[PDB]
From a paper:
Class I RNRs consist of a substrate-binding component (NrdA or α) and a radical-generating component (NrdB or β). Here, we crystallized and solved the structures of an N-terminally truncated form of LbNrdB lacking the ATP-cone domain, LbNrdBΔ99, in two forms: apo and aerobically Mn2+ loaded.
Aerobically Mn2+-reconstituted LbNrdB∆99 crystallized in space group P212121 with one dimer in the asymmetric unit. Anomalous difference maps at 2.2 Å resolution from data collected at a wavelength on the high-energy side of the Mn2+ K edge (1.85 Å) clearly confirm the identity of the metals. The Mn2+ ions are 3.9 Å from each other. Two acidic residues, Glu200 and Glu298, bridge the ions. One manganese ion (Mn1) is heptacoordinate, having a bidentate interaction with Glu170 and monodentate interactions to Glu200, Glu298, His203 and a water molecule. As previously seen, a conserved lysine residue, Lys174, is projected inwards from an unusual loop that bisects helix B, and its side chain is held in place by a network of H-bonds to the carbonyl oxygen atoms of Glu170 and Glu200, as well as the Mn2+-coordinating side chains of the same residues. However triggered, the conformational changes clearly open up a channel from the surface of the protein that leads to the Mn site, which has previously been proposed to be important for the diffusion of superoxide. The crystal structure of the highly homologous NrdB protein from L. blandensis reveals a fully occupied dimeric manganese metal centre with Tyr207 (corresponding to F. ignava Tyr276 that aligns with the radical-containing tyrosine residue in RNRs from subclasses Ia and Ib) positioned with its −OH group at a distance of 7.6 Å from Mn1 in the metal site, locked in that position by an H-bond to the conserved Thr294 (Thr363 in F. ignava NrdB).
Residue numbers in the entry:
A (entry chain B), B (entry chain A): 104 to 399
Write the structure that this text describes.
Amino acid sequence: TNIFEKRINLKPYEYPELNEYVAAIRHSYWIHTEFNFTSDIQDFKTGLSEVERSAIKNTMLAISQIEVAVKTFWGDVHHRLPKPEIAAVGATFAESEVRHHDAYSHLLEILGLNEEFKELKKKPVIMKRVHYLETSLKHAKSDDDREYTESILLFALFIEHVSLFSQFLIIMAFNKHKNMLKGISNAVEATSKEEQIHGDFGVDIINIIKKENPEWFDEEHNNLIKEMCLNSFEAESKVVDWIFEKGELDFLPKAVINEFLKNRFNKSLEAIGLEKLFDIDEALLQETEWFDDEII
Amino acid sequence: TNIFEKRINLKPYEYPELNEYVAAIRHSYWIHTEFNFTSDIQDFKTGLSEVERSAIKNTMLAISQIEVAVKTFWGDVHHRLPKPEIAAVGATFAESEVRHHDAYSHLLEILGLNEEFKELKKKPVIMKRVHYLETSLKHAKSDDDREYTESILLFALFIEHVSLFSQFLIIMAFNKHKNMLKGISNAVEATSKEEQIHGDFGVDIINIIKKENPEWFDEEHNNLIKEMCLNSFEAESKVVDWIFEKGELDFLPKAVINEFLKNRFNKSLEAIGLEKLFDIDEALLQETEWFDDEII
Ligand SMILES: [Mn+2]
Ligand SMILES: [Mn+2]
Ligand SMILES: [Mn+2]
Ligand SMILES: [Mn+2]
């Protein structure tokens, strides 16, 4: 098998196991119109202290920075990985991103955050985030399979599996602790599950590429993956600092969120056979174990 | 205002009305696992005469010739029509085609038609159908916007709005008259509604292209569209002859199916401002009015 080459017959599948990702998204499928956000609008308006409102506002803006955008990467994977089973997953994933866009676009509207969203791009922390996101996808349109592989790798391991996860954690933790933001936490939980599925497929694709082209993955390029991992963590850790610019939440300190992120980065590296990059404080990490127990 | 030109900023939308197509497919969304085909399997095995079974088998094979294939045209429209609103529709449509593929692939399996499906491509009537289908999409990957426009036009007006519709009509008519093939007619009705939506969006895209580039739609190019309309009808009319090779169904004669097809071809031409091509026998057309009353 060669993942990069087109095949003559539709059947049999060369990577039949990838078909499970279509079933996974059909099971996770959701539209924001299934949730009721009336209490969330009221909570955001009058139920929060100024510290809590600033944290929630910034978290919603940070999710939207990624979700409220044109996201065609998954829908285009078939051009460079021309397999029917990959094209099926890619199309299923591309549609799920349209559902995410509509959900967060609706949430910015009803929370009265459209003007703040338009001005978000001017923030240095956001520009720094955009830099690592654009660098990660610099080869998304490359004619070289090895360069394109770098884009899949960084996109799946770090963007899909980690970029939004401090934000998903903040919303879920807020609902778990305060029983507020019911509709938003439902939408966030549904988005988390789909991003987890997106990254898992990308991890599987990378392991197929690595199995078929082991010589592309030397100690040298493994060091290049590790420095991109560090850049992603530093940028996301700074986004966390900005989210809590008006004060930390006592039940979810930044130190707890940072350990949660480092662990996700480690798991992404380990998923493709690399060694872990971050030393983990187990006691601080334990505080967020409930998140993965919910997402699965 | 140019449909072919990239707009990086998400809002304001240039064609906000195209968003209705994403909501239309979310409303029509279905998976074959929502239907029960147990009675259909039994009907196909023991409930049909030799004439009826041959007609149903050939109809299912003809639907599958189009549906059981990699269908990435809709998911790629954004490359040449780089608008966020178009990209959202394209991704939603590309996913619906994966659902259609899984549905008809499941139906070929449970009806024991996998081997007959593998050999279908060798039939002269099928080769003749493939010829007009491939000719219609010959410019699907062109760098010239005018040539690409020809592919969208033929694909939407004739392939999406008509190619499968004699088959959808045959299945629904069989269920209406005989109260058999319950699950299959449900899946066919659900597919018909989504193909109707697919072609409607394509018609809207063509009318935007025609509004922005009226000089592209000259008498010479309109004559080519009419010549392609005739080629599509002749090939689909021959597919109908093949479906009924073992005998016609008294309740749905070929003359009735052919008038149904000619009328659909006329409506596609009229939808983009071209004149009707076929003379219609109104009495024979009236016999299939119930079909559009169900789909629309
Ligand atoms: Mn998303
Ligand atoms: Mn994703
Ligand atoms: Mn279809
Ligand atoms: Mn279609």
